[PDB]
């Protein structure tokens, strides 16, 4: 039972730029150590073992290095293919344990969200719900706010948010934020505003509609 | 070539247990360890234990010492993992791990996943909403896809043709129920001149739907 510290938990970094990860051993590992690579929704791919050796077809910009409890792994010309969260694991002892993982964000320019607002599908309403659906897509940074305006007057609850993970073809997050009603409280207003906050625009986006088209 | 092949998502009742396998193929060394490992969403790989196909031995992290039972199959080159006395901590994704050998280098092989989902409450198929939008160049359109147990769906358009352009949102849980929603972005002069249409499985329920965007 050997422990295994890594750092830092999240990076952020553009394209070309040099990167460091470390793993700390609470004891003695003689490089036994692998680095891996979690893309989202999928398995871990394998990058060093044996503390340096790269493994099959992995490219020559990764590299890991140290030795005894301090381990460490470099990415020089970091490529777009490189986004993930990178774990360590030993193998010096009979338990196998990994670090808690480094999460590495891609940087990329400020984008605001393109923001969508629906109104419920004339099915939803005839079965008596009405849900309000927003979606905020392709913004950076992931830093962000909405806020549901009724007829002028803010709405707290009902509201249910979801976020995206980071986007391997434009590095933009995207998120989701969805207003159920009853159908008879839905009938009851006509102007449904669905307002965005972000650092891009000082003024919040906005994006209406009103019940009678 | 190399891979490991596992088995389909469970649901079960807390205090039951499962079975879980992983079956290998064309492993140039037979000696190597089958490996099982736990995650949870948005958190760390966690290492549950391992075997020996040679002899049938095992290792367990201490927090899996009674939880956790790995077997194998050297005979099928098949390994399996038994969880007992389930509970809604249990619910995870679950993966096996296996290393191999070819001359003086090392490769490592994983499994695509099996998910377990422990909970009392009942299964149900999801509704699924199409959003057109009331009155640019690109035109999105939306799918709501609501009131569904136990995750996941899949969520893909026009029979997964369109495959650019797709936001997917993660699933939240609430009152046993999830909800989710699925956005895509196309040309004005695809819709609405164009069929353009929401699929969506729920395996659970065994239900299939596809769902066009009519406009208004
Ligand atoms: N037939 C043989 O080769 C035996 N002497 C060895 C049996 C191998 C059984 N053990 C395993 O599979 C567990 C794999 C551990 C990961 C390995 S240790 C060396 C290499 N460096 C790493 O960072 N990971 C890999």
């Known amino acids: 039972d050997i422990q295994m510290t890594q750092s830092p938990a999240s990076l952020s970094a553009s394209v070309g730029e040099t990167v460091t990860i470390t793993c700390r051993a609470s004891?003695?590992?003689?490089?036994?150590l692998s680095w891996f690579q979690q893309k989202q929704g999928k398995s871990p791919q394998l990058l060093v073992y044996?503390?340096?050796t790269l493994a099959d077809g992995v490219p020559s910009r990764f590299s890991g290095s140290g030795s005894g409890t301090q381990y460490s792994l470099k990415i020089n010309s970091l490529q777009p293919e490189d986004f993930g969260t990178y774990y360590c694991?030993?193998?010096?002892?009979?338990?196998?344990?990994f670090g808690g993982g480094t999460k590495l964000e891609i940087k990329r320019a400020d984008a605001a969200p393109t923001v969508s607002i629906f109104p419920p599908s004339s099915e939803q309403l005839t079965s008596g719900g009405a849900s309000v659906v927003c979606f905020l897509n392709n913004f950076y940074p992931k830093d962000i706010n909405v806020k549901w305006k009724i007829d002028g007057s803010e709405r707290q609850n009902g509201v249910l948010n979801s976020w995206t993970d980071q986007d391997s073809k434009d590095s933009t997050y995207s998120m989701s934020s969805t207003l159920t009603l009853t159908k008879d409280e839905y009938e009851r207003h006509n102007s449904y505003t669905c307002e965005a906050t972000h650092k891009t625009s000082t003024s919040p986006i906005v994006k209406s509609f009103n019940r009678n088209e | 070539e190399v891979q490991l092949q596992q088995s389909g998502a469970e649901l079960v009742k807390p205090g039951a247990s499962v079975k879980l396998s992983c079956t290998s193929s064309?492993?140039?060394?037979?000696?190597?360890?089958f490996q099982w490992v736990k995650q949870r969403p948005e958190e760390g790989l966690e290492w549950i234990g391992r075997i020996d196909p040679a002899n049938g031995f095992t290792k367990y992290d201490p927090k899996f010492q009674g939880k956790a039972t790995i077997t194998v199959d050297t005979s099928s080159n098949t390994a399996y993992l038994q969880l007992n006395s389930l509970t809604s901590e249990d619910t995870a994704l679950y993966y096996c791990?296996?290393?191999?050998?070819?001359?003086?280098?090392?490769?490592?092989?994983w499994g695509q996943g099996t998910l377990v989902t422990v909970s009392a409450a009942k299964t149900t198929p999801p509704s699924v909403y199409p959003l057109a939008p009331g009155s640019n160049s690109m035109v999105t359109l939306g799918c709501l896809v609501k009131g569904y147990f136990p995750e996941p769906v899949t969520v893909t358009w026009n029979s997964g043709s369109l495959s650019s352009g797709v936001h997917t949102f993660p699933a939240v849980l609430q009152s046993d129920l999830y909800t989710l929603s699925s956005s895509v972005t196309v040309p004005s002069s695809t819709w609405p001149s164009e069929t353009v249409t929401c699929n969506v499985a729920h395996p659970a329920s065994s239900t299939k739907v596809d769902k066009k965007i009519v406009p208004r």
């Open positions: 044996s503390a340096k």
């Open positions: 694991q030993h193998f010096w002892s009979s338990i196998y344990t």
């Open positions: 791990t296996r290393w191999d050998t070819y001359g003086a280098a090392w490769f490592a092989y």
């Open positions: 064309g492993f140039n060394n037979k000696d190597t360890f």
């Open positions: 004891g003695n590992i003689h490089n036994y």
